[PDB]
Design a protein around this nucleic acid. Structure first.
Ligand code: NA
Length: 60
DNA sequence: CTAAACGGT
DNA sequence: ACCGTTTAG
């Protein structure tokens, strides 16, 4: 029973990506604040940031 | 494409 | 929490 696949708002993405630009890795508090600000789960943001780095690493 | 899962660090 | 790799909405 898979977790239901998230669909991010344009705005969410936008602000995520903005975060990722500023900082490629977030403290736990930073993660939490962001999650709140975007009305996402810690885990939502966490996984997002991972796959994001994962893609980043595909450029570097 | 990419969010989520898996298993080992 | 993360990585790398893989699974699947
Ligand atoms: Na680090």
């Amino acid at each position: 029973p898979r977790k239901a696949r998230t669909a991010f708002s344009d705005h969410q993405l936008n602000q995520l990506e903005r975060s990722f630009e500023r900082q490629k890795y977030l403290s736990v508090q930073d993660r939490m604040d962001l999650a709140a600000a975007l009305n996402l789960t810690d885990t939502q943001v966490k996984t997002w940031y991972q796959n994001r780095r994962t893609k980043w690493k595909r450029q570097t």
